């Protein structure tokens, strides 16, 4: 039983692009006709304040470079001057059937994989993963920098069966902690909804709406696009911002990054906090790669040792492996 040379898992928990529209607090229940936050341009005259070396450095170029202003054109997005509330709306499907790959060479390896995943689900449900997913929808992880420094953040979650609303939840994101996964009755209800969705026992479509008090005319933070920077033509403009038809927006994979911050099971340090689930579990901003393959906690090592050789790891590492199967990806050689 060698590994399959081709493996591919389609993702579950598929979000959409979040839209931002600004308005006034306590006009909050009628947040349906609020105008969108537009992305505009402004010019910026700054000084050169980076680090400058000492090798091949004529001091005429140095002092000529420091003592001269820099000109540049950026994009900003601000609230209107008579509005102090950011509204961020997106939707979320929960597909289910999180064991079946979409492409596999071997037939014995695929049947062994389905017996392993079905053994996991029959031993214990999806209650842990849906509890942590419910905590990431409870607070406002998907408000990345917009959450930082806010008076009150309110999250409203709706469940949709038809052109209707089945059950509505209304949370408070600042009371719910950022690092402490504490239980609650409503989070157990919504965790039963998501856990009922991932098991394939129904169709789950959720509508998530987030509200934040920032201030009158302050700055919101959409996601930033690529200027490829291939050699020549750096261009006058800088910091272009992502958008939809005349509205600022956030990419879908960034919200999808914010939902799957589960992993509190690093070998190195459990004191920092949960950072998101990746094979070779890494953080791009910190420049570090936790969960090294020189250890025995990598996803590929645990999956090989748990499918091929029946060496079941600890329970929390099994939550890690099934979390990587809900993530999906391109596996195999």
């Amino acid at each position: 039983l060698s590994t399959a040379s081709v493996l591919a898992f389609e993702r579950k928990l598929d979000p959409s692009d979040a839209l931002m529209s600004a308005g006034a607090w306590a006009q909050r229940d009628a947040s349906q006709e609020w105008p969108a936050v537009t992305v505009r341009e402004k010019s910026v005259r700054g000084t050169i304040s980076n680090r400058l070396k000492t090798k091949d450095r004529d001091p005429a170029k140095l002092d000529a470079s420091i003592q001269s202003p820099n000109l540049q054109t950026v994009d900003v997005a601000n609230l209107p001057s008579d509005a102090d509330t950011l509204k961020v709306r997106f939707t979320l499907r929960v597909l289910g059937g999180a064991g079946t790959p979409s492409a596999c060479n071997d037939a014995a390896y695929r049947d062994k994989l389905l017996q392993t995943v079905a053994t996991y689900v029959n031993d214990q449900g999806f209650a842990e993963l849906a509890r942590r997913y419910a905590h990431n929808l409870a607070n406002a992880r998907f408000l990345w920098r917009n959450r930082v420094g806010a008076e009150a953040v309110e999250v409203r979650i709706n469940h949709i069966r038809q052109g209707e609303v089945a059950r509505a939840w209304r949370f408070d994101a600042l009371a719910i902690g950022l690092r402490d996964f504490k239980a609650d009755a409503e989070l157990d209800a919504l965790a039963e909804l998501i856990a009922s969705g991932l098991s394939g026992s129904g169709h789950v479509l959720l509508e998530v709406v987030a509200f934040a008090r920032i201030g009158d005319g302050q700055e919101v933070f959409p996601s930033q696009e690529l200027i490829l920077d291939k050699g020549d033509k750096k261009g006058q403009k800088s910091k272009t911002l992502y958008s939809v038809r005349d509205a600022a927006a956030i990419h879908s994979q960034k919200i999808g990054n914010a939902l799957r911050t589960i992993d509190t099971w690093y070998p190195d340090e459990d004191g920092l906090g949960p950072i998101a689930v990746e094979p070779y579990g890494s953080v791009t901003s910190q420049g570090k790669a936790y969960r090294q393959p020189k250890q025995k906690l990598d996803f590929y090592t645990l999956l090989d040792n748990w499918v091929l050789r029946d060496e079941a790891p600890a329970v929390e590492q099994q939550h890690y492996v099934i979390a990587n199967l809900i993530r999906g990806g391109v596996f195999g050689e």
Partner: protein, 305 residues
């Protein structure tokens, strides 16, 4: 190539994050092969369980916005990529490139089976839509329902039976819901005509493709050549070079049970239209036929004219 009895219509399918590359030489709106292969995937998920048969697909393409960029005043365009996770080691990776679109399209279909006698129209259309709502249409996700679920009810129309006044009546009832969109067909007989016009010098066809969709400025002894339509180059099939292989021969296949060849695409001419030019809407669906004695594949809409 078999004419369908019904024409199932999916009203407003909005793709998020599509694939706007589609070929090594054309760029924009994706291939017809994604839109036919989606229909065969519905045939593998629904049509064997409701005893129907889905063969073709009708592209309508209401909306299209590609994530592009044009800095530095140049008259060419670049892309808008995304990030990837870090290196295997932990520094950074290389950058592959991938196209992108926020598409919205309506799809005609074609039904052959006996499920109409066993099931009413709203049941068939409801099952097909509520399976297509959990799939991925052209390499990107399908946006679920919102406040714009108001056009989301389907339609279904038997084509053979009934009087001709009900045929043209309900046909115009269909084409008032495909009303802002622009249909898409294949027009290779025009390419044979332009080969016979430019057959004074050289009958090559790829340079004809390079000399159809472009602004020909012909000076006076300057006159822009009049375009006879909104023509566009599309990929139109595969023309396999390698002889066929047995299943357990090539390492790193998808599965070890179906044969293999190495293919390349095959470039053809297509045309965007208004839906009111079409005589009968059953002459619009994209089929694909084959003859695997040789390497000759194509998508087509036979009998459009």
């Amino acid at each position: 190539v078999t004419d369908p009895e019904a024409l199932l219509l999916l009203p407003r399918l909005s793709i998020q994050n599509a694939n706007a590359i589609s070929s090594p030489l054309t760029w924009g709106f994706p291939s017809p092969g994604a839109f036919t292969g989606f229909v065969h995937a519905l045939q593998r998920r629904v049509g064997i369980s409701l005893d129907i048969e889905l063969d073709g697909v009708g592209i309508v393409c209401h909306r299209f916005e590609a994530q592009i960029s044009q800095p530095a005043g140049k008259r060419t365009k670049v892309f808008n990529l995304t990030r990837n996770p870090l290196n295997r080691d932990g520094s950074t990776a290389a950058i592959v490139e991938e196209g992108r679109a926020h598409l919205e399209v309506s799809l005609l279909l074609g039904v052959h089976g006996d499920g109409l006698d066993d099931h009413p129209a709203q049941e068939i259309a409801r099952q097909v839509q509520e399976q297509a709502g959990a799939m991925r249409l052209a390499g990107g996700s399908i946006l679920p329902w919102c406040n714009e679920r108001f056009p989301a009810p389907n339609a279904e129309l038997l084509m053979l039976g009934g009087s001709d006044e009900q045929r043209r009546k309900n046909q115009r009832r269909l084409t008032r819901r495909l009303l802002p969109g622009f249909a898409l067909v294949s027009r290779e007989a025009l390419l044979q005509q332009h080969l016979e016009t430019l057959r004074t010098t050289l009958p090559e066809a790829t340079t004809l493709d390079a000399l159809l969709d472009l602004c020909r400025i012909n000076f006076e002894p300057w006159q822009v050549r009049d375009k006879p339509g909104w023509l566009v180059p599309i990929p139109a099939g595969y023309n396999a070079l390698s002889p066929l292989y047995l299943p357990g021969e090539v390492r790193n296949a998808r599965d070890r049970e179906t044969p293999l060849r190495f293919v390349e695409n095959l470039f053809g001419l297509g045309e965007w239209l208004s839906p009111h030019r079409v005589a009968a809407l059953s002459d619009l669906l994209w089929y694909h036929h084959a003859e695997p004695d040789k390497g000759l594949y194509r998508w087509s809409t036979p009998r459009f004219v």
